Amino acid sequence: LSTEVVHLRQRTEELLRCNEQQAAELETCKEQLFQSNMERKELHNTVMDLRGNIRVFCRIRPPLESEENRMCCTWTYHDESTVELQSIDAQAKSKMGQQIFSFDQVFHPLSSQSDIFEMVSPLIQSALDGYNICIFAYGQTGSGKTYTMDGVPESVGVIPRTVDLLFDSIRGYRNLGWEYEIKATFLEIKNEVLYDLLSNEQKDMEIRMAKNNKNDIYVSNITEETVLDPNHLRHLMHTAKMNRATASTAGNERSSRSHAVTKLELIGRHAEKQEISVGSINLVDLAGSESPINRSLSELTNVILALLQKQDHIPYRNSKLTHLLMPSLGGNSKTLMFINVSPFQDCFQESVKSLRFAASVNSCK
Amino acid sequence: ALSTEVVHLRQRTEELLRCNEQQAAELETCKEQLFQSNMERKELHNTVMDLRGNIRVFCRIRPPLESEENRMCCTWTYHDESTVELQSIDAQAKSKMGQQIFSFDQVFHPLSSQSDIFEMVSPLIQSALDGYNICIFAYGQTGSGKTYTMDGVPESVGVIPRTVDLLFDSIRGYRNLGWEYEIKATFLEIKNEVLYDLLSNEQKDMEIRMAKNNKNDIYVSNITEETVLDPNHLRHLMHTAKMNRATASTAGNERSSRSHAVTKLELIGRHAEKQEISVGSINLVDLAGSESPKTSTRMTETKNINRSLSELTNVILALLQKQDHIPYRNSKLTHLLMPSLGGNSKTLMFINVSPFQDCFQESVKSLRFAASVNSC
Amino acid sequence: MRECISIHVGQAGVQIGNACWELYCLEHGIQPDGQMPDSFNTFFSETGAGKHVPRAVFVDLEPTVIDEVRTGTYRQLFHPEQLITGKEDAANNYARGHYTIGKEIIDLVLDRIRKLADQCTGLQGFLVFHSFGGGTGSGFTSLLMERLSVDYGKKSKLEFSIYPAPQVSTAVVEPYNSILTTHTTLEHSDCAFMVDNEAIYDICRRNLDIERPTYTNLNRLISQIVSSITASLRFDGALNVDLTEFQTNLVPYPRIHFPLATYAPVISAEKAYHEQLSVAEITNACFEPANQMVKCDPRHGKYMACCLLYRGDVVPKDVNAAIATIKTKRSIQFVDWCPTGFKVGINYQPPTVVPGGDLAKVQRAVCMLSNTTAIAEAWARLDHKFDLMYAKRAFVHWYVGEGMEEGEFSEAREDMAALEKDYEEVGV
Amino acid sequence: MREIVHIQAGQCGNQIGAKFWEVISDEHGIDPTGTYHGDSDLQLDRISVYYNEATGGKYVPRAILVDLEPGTMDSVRSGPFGQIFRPDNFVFGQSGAGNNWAKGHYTEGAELVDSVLDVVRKEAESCDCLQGFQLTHSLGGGTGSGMGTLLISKIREEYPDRIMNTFSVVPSPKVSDTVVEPYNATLSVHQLVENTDETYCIDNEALYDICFRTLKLTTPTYGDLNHLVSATMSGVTTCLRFPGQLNADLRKLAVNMVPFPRLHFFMPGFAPLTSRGSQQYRALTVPELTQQVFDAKNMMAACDPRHGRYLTVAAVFRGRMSMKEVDEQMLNVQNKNSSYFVEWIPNNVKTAVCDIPPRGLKMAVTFIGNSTAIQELFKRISEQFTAMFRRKAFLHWYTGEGMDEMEFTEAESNMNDLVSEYQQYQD
Ligand SMILES: Nc1nc2c(ncn2[C@@H]2O[C@H](COP(=O)(O)OP(=O)(O)OP(=O)(O)O)[C@@H](O)[C@H]2O)c(=O)[nH]1
Ligand SMILES: Nc1nc2c(ncn2[C@@H]2O[C@H](COP(=O)(O)OP(=O)(O)O)[C@@H](O)[C@H]2O)c(=O)[nH]1
Ligand SMILES: Nc1ncnc2c1ncn2[C@@H]1O[C@H](COP(=O)(O)OP(=O)(O)O)[C@@H](O)[C@H]1O
Ligand SMILES: [Mg+2]
């Protein structure tokens, strides 16, 4: 009986040695995984910068069933990045000159929601790289800004799609050591006043410089929930839209004029190493661009153009929305802009007002 | 304490065997992830190259000597790191040539040394680590610094010594990835539009022939291709070429400074576990001097030397303009380097210029067509 | 004696010189042998024996046309050692004529011209006749011009090159040779007179009324031009003007030295009877754009200078009246800074018509050496043709393979562009 | 004096060269013996370019006769103007290529190239300043292709400065005379695009059209067919052999014709082709020659130029004329046919007016057109070559001689690149 004891005595010794080398070899490859992952972060960021700026994106939406009897405009498509619109009124056709606008890409009414998410997928990685991102939906009332951001259950918007991609990478990144916590704040900018979409307990809210980063901004008293899974955030967004008090039935102006800011801060901490990231994505659904308050909308127009001019001073604190996005409008980060345009002659004067902003972007950048 | 040891160490066997299986399964997962992790940056990095380039033009101006700094030198003006302005001091040259401003990817100061060149080595070897046919070109006149940057000096080595050192330690990391890389050294010379061998003194007939596998893959028959085993062996391979390429360079300017040496290091990476084979090649190619042909003793082949440069200039312009057909076969150098010049392949374009006034005109010729690449 | 010599490179140069020296020996009663059965001393180095050897240096890279002149009636007229022959033509290439055959015979030609110069007592200048699209007439001509500028410099180098016609180019590679030779000759030619083949074709069409014009008639006209130019030296007149005064009177700046020639009395024998050939009418005729020897509209550009050479029974009062009337003309535009350039070359030696020619016996003849702004557009379109050739890099392989680089082509193109800039800033 | 060496490969090349030498002797008034009896001393001026001086005032052609079947030259030797050749020039094998380029380039070529190379050097050193070599052969058979491919490869590597004239007879598009002429032609053009720098493509089918329709001939004998080629080819060099207003040569047109080294395949054309009885109805002036020589009806090649663009046009003239007419008429066709001319080469016409016309004629024009219509001929051959390639038809005859199948891919691939350039430069 003593013979088998000796046989397992060396078996214990050899299994200790095999596992010790197995673990030691494992950690070397594991460290190689970390160094291989961090270079991919910069490459993704570099591509965005080499692409220039991810602003100047027009999305034309098709007329609805109730909009079949409305009169359209002459939409002229050029290649895939330039679009021209002309009024059917030939009397004004000779007086309009050149209503030509060139964009980074052009989306036509036949583009599905997944087409928009193609340019929204790469920035999600950039958000994971500790960089602040924003998505702006801009245009007149009825253009389709809410459909681009929120959409419908049949064709989900960017907000449902960003969460699915965000969590898919996070679980895959679990093999890469990093652990992430998702913080969701839902807020509405009605008129230079901040309203919480996650609580009915009306209080006063103020914006102050961050305690650990003077260039960063935190919102006081905001409800900041930890997102566990896409089911949790989907419930959180449902609460926000119900609490938003959608008065489109009676008094649509109140609901429309209010800006909708969705901020999703990503925090990444890596044990056994050093890693600090506060990258956030601000999915802001901007209000109507119709001519008349507009303090937030007008300042957002000026701040964006000033940044392209490399202006020495930016009036970030000139409005609540611009000051809310003061750290979300920096130089190192990358900005997106969606211009939703109604394909109607009655909106032709409003359509050109949505597009000359982009015409002033590329001419300034 | 014997019967109890039987059960306890049997439990230890299960505790370790479970750990054996626990570590084995995720060891495959971590190795599998690392392949795609390196594959993700593999397609991410060339995208960075594609947006900013895939035909990269770099200019370096060499510093004048202690006695040559007192020698007349054209004014050097650096608007930024990417644009350089050279102005002829002569008033008559100013009235006709005017302002000579040129735009490139990056401008090298005479005091930049080889630091930023080595900073360019890491992205370009990564493209080679991506299994891409990458080529570098050393264009310029005699004494402009082509030999100082390619081969280098003992105190500050050139690109060739730096590339070999960094390549060898790089593949050691991929040896931890289960990748076995076979690297092949090929040396050849293009003088008088006929190829020779640097590693062999025997006069053999060389001809350009497409490889059996693919038409786009090119080899040369009867070459002395050597399997590289270690750096010191590879270092000796390049060292053996110098004395075989022994000819007048500055004293007579007979064959050297008017010659095209092609140094191709074909890397063949293999992964036994995942049956994946990565095929790449680097082309450490230096170009002949672009001086106007004035040596009437042998001016006939200098035109062919100029023809290779002219055809190469025609080829690179064709790539930029998206020309359907590119005249690769008009010259031996372009035809041989066709795999590394078209498609996904990426070219560094390094030009050397001289700061002296007498070389201002030849410097202008170097800059304008190199800047023409950046324009398109 | 302020004697001068002439050079002939290219088939154009050789044919032109043949017709020219034929006219010359006709002027002074010189037989084809070389004797006359002083005035002629300028171009003829007459020895003690009756052999008035011409001061001509005929050079060609192929022996065909030189053998032809060695076969014609003037073989014994010319000194046999003067005629320098190559073996292979420059073949439309500035490259060949400037690098591959040019320097392989330039030693012999320079030795011959130096021997001629030491023969001359008082050297006046140099005359060269060539083409632009011609490989020899570009490469060899530019190499010889720079060589003579190095050797002498102070002497007068005069070019009688022929312009490439605006609508027809016999050589498909004319723009390359033209641009290269202009770049390499701009700083080595004192003054380069211009003549165009298409313009003289139109002139002999509508004025000579000849339906079958050959190169012989063009050479006759060019010989008349050169005879008018050299009459002031070969003969006495009221106001003799030599080649030295030409650079003073004509060129305002060193770069702008491209005047164009014109010949007014170009009527035929039949039309001679219907006209009296007065000084005023021929003076007006020489200002007609249709009578210009270069295909351009002088009405579209201002004039820089006007050198007038009169020969025959002409009165200075008539010339003064004609120029005064022209000063009052509207279409004749001028620049303000030089409002008095009308230097006259009045002479009383009537031109002589060759037997079997197309010109008529005219009492008085005038040779208009106009310098005007009307060549800027011609240079612009020549540079445009060069850019069209260079954009696709067509034919560049030959030149880069026989003596140059495309960088040098860029240098020549930008030099022509700078010349255009200087021309247009002078014009305003 | 810019002498030219003549080489004839294949029986077709031998017959064409015999016709060419007989018409040249007609130009210079040379009997079968070699005694000169002409009247114009201009013949003696450039008699050296084709005839070597011989004792007793005789002359011999500077020609090399190469073949693998001895019988062909026996007819040439027995026929008129056969003894005019120096007998040492007759170099031949005994086996015979048998319409197989495999034999003519690797086995029979290797054993015989040395025999012809030495006599080439002997003739080459018998000259003052050599101008170039003219090769007469065909792309159909093996002797005319195996010899030519080897010789042009050989001659180039020791005479790089010289120019190469290859008078290759391109296979007919429809009336095929060889089951495997795609194999000969495709392998032939591989060496052509690498070594020579000017090639004249001639098609018998189009040549049949010239005699049957333009000349309204009824008996298209090869003697008549070769006569047109011989007359066309002599006009190419008349500017070199005779004086004129613009004395050109092969060097003159060499730079003019080819914008790029590879695009050196041209369409010959001879203007004066009045029928047996139509000469009375037709006046003979510069005009009629101009439009007649610019017709697809008159092209020696079987390609319609209207399908492509004239990259470069040459026009060599013979006889007495005023160059003003040729000036504006070349300008005239340059305007009316602007679609047929490449846009980025304005005024793409070369004129080489000579003085002496052909005997029995007053004016003559030789047309050398480097149009882009050639690519339709190559794709026809490319389609025919690839039709019989993957089915491996007759492959054993070529493969069994000692060449790899990938070599067939080289010729197919390289010639495909030649095709791709034409349509690229067509736009
Ligand atoms: N006006 C005029 N021009 C002529 C005459 N003969 C030749 N030319 C011009 O001369 C040019 C011919 O080229 P050349 O000057 O002879 O040059 P080349 O010696 O033949 O050398 P390549 O041009 O390379 O062949 C043509 O473009 C004609 O315009 C002539 O008799 N009168
Ligand atoms: N014009 C002409 N063409 C010929 C003559 N004889 C043969 N050919 C052509 O040449 C081809 C024959 O191939 P060839 O080269 O002569 O065979 P090889 O000598 O054995 O190589 C055929 O396609 C014919 O079209 C001839 O007398 N005149
Ligand atoms: N591509 C589309 N297909 C169908 N309906 C759309 C589309 N885009 C927008 N809509 C309609 O627009 C409405 C959304 O209103 P929207 O125009 O986004 O408000 P806002 O004026 O704030 O942008 C939805 O009810 C939807 O039916
Ligand atoms: Mg909305």
mmCIF file of C-alpha atoms and ligand atoms in Angstrom, chain D residues 9-16 66-69 72 96-101 137-147 169-172 175-178 181 184 202-205 207-208 221-227 229, ligand 2:
data_model
loop_
_atom_site.group_PDB
_atom_site.id
_atom_site.type_symbol
_atom_site.label_atom_id
_atom_site.label_comp_id
_atom_site.label_asym_id
_atom_site.label_seq_id
_atom_site.Cartn_x
_atom_site.Cartn_y
_atom_site.Cartn_z
ATOM 1 C CA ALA D 9 13.137 34.391 -91.281
ATOM 2 C CA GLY D 10 10.661 31.717 -92.336
ATOM 3 C CA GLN D 11 9.612 30.869 -95.885
ATOM 4 C CA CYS D 12 7.076 33.709 -95.894
ATOM 5 C CA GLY D 13 9.825 36.085 -94.815
ATOM 6 C CA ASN D 14 12.129 34.721 -97.511
ATOM 7 C CA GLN D 15 9.545 35.272 -100.250
ATOM 8 C CA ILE D 16 8.698 38.780 -99.023
ATOM 9 C CA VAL D 66 17.601 32.255 -92.521
ATOM 10 C CA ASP D 67 15.413 29.159 -92.769
ATOM 11 C CA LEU D 68 15.094 25.557 -91.639
ATOM 12 C CA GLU D 69 13.779 24.027 -94.889
ATOM 13 C CA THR D 72 12.613 27.579 -100.103
ATOM 14 C CA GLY D 96 12.642 22.111 -90.234
ATOM 15 C CA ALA D 97 10.477 23.841 -87.642
ATOM 16 C CA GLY D 98 7.259 22.396 -89.061
ATOM 17 C CA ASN D 99 5.138 25.377 -87.964
ATOM 18 C CA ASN D 100 6.317 24.827 -84.380
ATOM 19 C CA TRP D 101 7.751 27.784 -82.470
ATOM 20 C CA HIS D 137 9.138 37.090 -91.246
ATOM 21 C CA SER D 138 5.653 35.908 -90.276
ATOM 22 C CA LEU D 139 3.938 35.180 -86.968
ATOM 23 C CA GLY D 140 2.124 32.107 -88.298
ATOM 24 C CA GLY D 141 4.744 29.411 -88.770
ATOM 25 C CA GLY D 142 7.657 28.353 -86.621
ATOM 26 C CA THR D 143 10.705 29.278 -88.684
ATOM 27 C CA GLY D 144 9.400 32.813 -89.179
ATOM 28 C CA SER D 145 8.617 33.073 -85.455
ATOM 29 C CA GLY D 146 11.194 30.911 -83.675
ATOM 30 C CA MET D 147 14.099 32.495 -85.530
ATOM 31 C CA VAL D 169 2.839 39.139 -90.684
ATOM 32 C CA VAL D 170 0.065 39.069 -88.079
ATOM 33 C CA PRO D 171 -2.220 36.017 -88.465
ATOM 34 C CA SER D 172 -5.388 36.632 -90.445
ATOM 35 C CA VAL D 175 -8.827 32.792 -93.099
ATOM 36 C CA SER D 176 -6.580 30.782 -90.804
ATOM 37 C CA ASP D 177 -3.648 28.971 -92.409
ATOM 38 C CA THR D 178 -2.470 27.174 -89.252
ATOM 39 C CA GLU D 181 -1.077 30.061 -85.121
ATOM 40 C CA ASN D 184 2.984 30.973 -82.460
ATOM 41 C CA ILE D 202 0.206 43.068 -91.855
ATOM 42 C CA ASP D 203 -2.875 40.895 -92.393
ATOM 43 C CA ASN D 204 -3.422 38.818 -95.522
ATOM 44 C CA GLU D 205 -7.209 39.109 -95.183
ATOM 45 C CA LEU D 207 -4.324 42.520 -98.075
ATOM 46 C CA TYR D 208 -6.740 40.259 -99.953
ATOM 47 C CA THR D 221 -1.045 35.572 -106.150
ATOM 48 C CA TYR D 222 1.432 35.904 -103.295
ATOM 49 C CA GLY D 223 3.815 37.599 -105.716
ATOM 50 C CA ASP D 224 1.264 40.386 -106.066
ATOM 51 C CA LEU D 225 0.487 40.366 -102.337
ATOM 52 C CA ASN D 226 4.174 40.601 -101.443
ATOM 53 C CA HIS D 227 4.599 43.332 -104.066
ATOM 54 C CA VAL D 229 4.354 45.029 -98.902
HETATM 55 N N1 LIG E 2 2.160 37.666 -98.099
HETATM 56 C C1 LIG E 2 2.606 36.389 -98.058
HETATM 57 N N2 LIG E 2 2.390 35.663 -96.933
HETATM 58 C C2 LIG E 2 2.815 34.383 -96.841
HETATM 59 C C3 LIG E 2 3.520 33.791 -97.984
HETATM 60 N N3 LIG E 2 3.830 32.530 -97.635
HETATM 61 C C4 LIG E 2 3.363 32.331 -96.377
HETATM 62 N N4 LIG E 2 2.758 33.436 -95.906
HETATM 63 C C5 LIG E 2 2.141 33.567 -94.568
HETATM 64 O O1 LIG E 2 3.009 32.980 -93.598
HETATM 65 C C6 LIG E 2 2.331 31.997 -92.816
HETATM 66 C C7 LIG E 2 3.123 30.703 -92.907
HETATM 67 O O2 LIG E 2 4.007 30.595 -91.796
HETATM 68 P P1 LIG E 2 5.597 30.547 -92.030
HETATM 69 O O3 LIG E 2 6.293 31.490 -91.081
HETATM 70 O O4 LIG E 2 5.942 30.883 -93.460
HETATM 71 O O5 LIG E 2 5.986 29.028 -91.682
HETATM 72 P P2 LIG E 2 7.501 28.672 -91.284
HETATM 73 O O6 LIG E 2 8.437 29.247 -92.318
HETATM 74 O O7 LIG E 2 7.671 27.174 -91.214
HETATM 75 O O8 LIG E 2 7.798 29.277 -89.935
HETATM 76 C C8 LIG E 2 0.932 31.834 -93.380
HETATM 77 O O9 LIG E 2 -0.035 32.178 -92.384
HETATM 78 C C9 LIG E 2 0.832 32.797 -94.545
HETATM 79 O O10 LIG E 2 -0.261 33.696 -94.347
HETATM 80 C C10 LIG E 2 3.718 34.646 -99.174
HETATM 81 O O11 LIG E 2 4.308 34.212 -100.183
HETATM 82 N N5 LIG E 2 3.246 35.897 -99.135
#
